[PDB]
Amino acid sequence: SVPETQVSILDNGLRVASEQSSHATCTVGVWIDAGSRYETEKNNGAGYFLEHLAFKGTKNRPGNALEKEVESIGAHLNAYSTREHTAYLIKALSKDLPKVVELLADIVQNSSLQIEKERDVILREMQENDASMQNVVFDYLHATAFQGTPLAQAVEGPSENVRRLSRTDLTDYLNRHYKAPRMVLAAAGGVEHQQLLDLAQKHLSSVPCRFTGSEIRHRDDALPLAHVAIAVEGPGWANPDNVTLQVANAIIGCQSFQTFNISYSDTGLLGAHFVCDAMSIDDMVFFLQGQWMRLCTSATESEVTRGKNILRNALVSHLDGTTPVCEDIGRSLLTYGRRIPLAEWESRIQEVDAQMLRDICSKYFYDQCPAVAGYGPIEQLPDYNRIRSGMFWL
Amino acid sequence: SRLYSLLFRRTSTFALTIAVGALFFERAFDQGADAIYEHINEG
């Protein structure tokens, strides 16, 4: 009926989590509790840089050898880095676990650091990373909301550091933030937990953040569209009320008016990002603020239901596939320390009603000072007094 | 901090505290000023 997410631990402290499923392939990944939040402004691009260099060269395998092999096995090799977590995962035919795991072992330890080229790659892309307006907006919604903290700095880092980075520095980040107790080996799909535990024993057995209500406005009138993000302080990753906030986002769901609940270790950003022609930015903002307020004082069981149901169809599961699940296993072992099953999520969803939703929404959204990040033709975007006054009703 | 959460955060309550306070503040202001005037002018 339902998978078990059997998880164990090893000498090193590395955890080995798995969730067997009847699908045939598997997504075996390594998560690491290491991101841009653990960097100290002298190595602001070390994690990103490592990834670029990683997946390319190692101790048992020279240069393409790993890349060459994974292709040989037919597996897809992916890696990503956030402000708090780093993931290296392989999607591959289950039978290949033996090598899907040994390969991952090299990638986390015995890696060989090309550095010159990757620097160029990162730098040049960054020179163009400016094209991703949305990412820009979201990396300032971070800078202006977490001013003076390690949560303001981006994952990529400033070009400065990128140019000024050396093997030893990298080696440090690698030797400092790649500890075995901060690592999860997660497997999803057609894997046996005992075989994966034996492979982890054979290989890999060797291994005050503050929100500041503020505003950044990057005005550039030549852009055709404007992107605006407004957020308040998210509860956190472990905070129980996160779920009643997700239902609130499901109630909200001008243009491209998305909604986000980004969570970090006891902090986060809860808000909305919308892209609109300049002339309508103010009307959008007014619209949006009215809605948050609607939930705060005027929810409706019907709509809550609409929200609970959409949330119910978002929960990730074997159906979503191996990777989606692995990814959830790795994040759950890194953040909560355990894999929360879908039945517990359903219980926490069904205990949410309209009264506690408007209570939790009044707790967070109502009256707190927001962080605003605008990019584009944002002259008609209202300044901080009008947004702050729109954060409450008379 | 309690006051903010109780009488100064909900605008309706904000008005309530203002009105009630004003209701009392006046009489007092009048009294104080009147008294002062009197002390100042003893006759």
Binding site: E41, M126, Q127, N129, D130, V136, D139, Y140, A143, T144, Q147, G148, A152, Q153, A154, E156, G157, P158, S159, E160, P208, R210, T212, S214, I216, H218, E233, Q368 | S1, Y4, S5
Partner: peptide, 24 residues
């Protein structure tokens, strides 16, 4: 790009923590 510089310091402005927000 957009990450080259960090938000300028407002320490001479910033006051000296939801605990305090309520009071502030």
């Amino acid at each position: 790009s957009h990450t080259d510089v960090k938000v300028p310091d407002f320490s001479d402005y910033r006051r000296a923590s939801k605990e305090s927000s309520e009071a502030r």
